[PDB]
Amino acid sequence: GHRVLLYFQMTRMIDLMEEYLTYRNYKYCRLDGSTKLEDRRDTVADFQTRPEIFIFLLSTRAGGLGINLTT
DNA sequence: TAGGGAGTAATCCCCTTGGCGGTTAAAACGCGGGGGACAGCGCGTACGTGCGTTTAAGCGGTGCTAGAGCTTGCTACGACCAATTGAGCGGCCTCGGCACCGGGATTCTCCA
Numbered sequence: 001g002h003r004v005l006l007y008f009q010m011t012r013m014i015d016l017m018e019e020y021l022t023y024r025n026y027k028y029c030r031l032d033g034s035t036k037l038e039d040r041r042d043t044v045a046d047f048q049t050r051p052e053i054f055i056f057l058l059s060t061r062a063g064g065l066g067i068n069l070t071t
Numbered sequence: 072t073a074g075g076g077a078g079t080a081a082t083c084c085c086c087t088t089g090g091c092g093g094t095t096a097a098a099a100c101g102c103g104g105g106g107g108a109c110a111g112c113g114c115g116t117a118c119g120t121g122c123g124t125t126t127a128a129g130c131g132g133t134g135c136t137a138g139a140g141c142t143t144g145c146t147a148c149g150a151c152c153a154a155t156t157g158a159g160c161g162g163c164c165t166c167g168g169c170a171c172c173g174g175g176a177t178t179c180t181c182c183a
């Protein structure tokens with residue numbers, strides 16, 4: 001039941017990672033420096049709202065600061 | 072020895088292209104007929120050809136002097152730059168010019 005944050009230094013890898021995560025059955029969401037600011041609010045609030053999501057795919061720099069991911 | 076350039080990838084703002092939907096106005100399609108394209112014809116006059124005349128353009132020659140083209144000397148003036156500011160650009164505001172509409176009046180066409 002360990003909801004989990006994955007940090008990447010490369011954007012192409014977090015693409016490949018969700019190809020793997022969609023080959024498996026893992027429910028995931030994504031935040032990186034290309035996501036637009038309202039999309040960032042929504043994904044952060046989505047992951048922090050509903051326990052259904054398993055993996056937060058998460059960029060090191062854009063996702064590394066300021067936000068709360070305490071769930 | 073160190074500073075700043077080379078490499079690279081993430082981050083995030085700007086902006087041009089493309090699609091969806093409607094809807095609506097302009098392009099496409101039809102067809103009658105008219106009148107303008109155009110061929111065919113007559114004349115006449117106006118332009119090309121030819122011949123004799125003249126006129127003056129072009130070539131060979133002489134003489135002159137203006138002025139283009141070059142050298143010299145110097146100082147005036149525009150390039151140059153450091154210090155100063157105010158003219159002119161970028162952003163923001165608003166109101167009045169002008170357009171667009173509607174309906175009543177005058178003009179222009181075309182057929183009788």
Ligand code: ALF
Pocket residue numbers: 065066067
């Ligand atoms: F210091 Al933080 F999010 F960790 F502002």
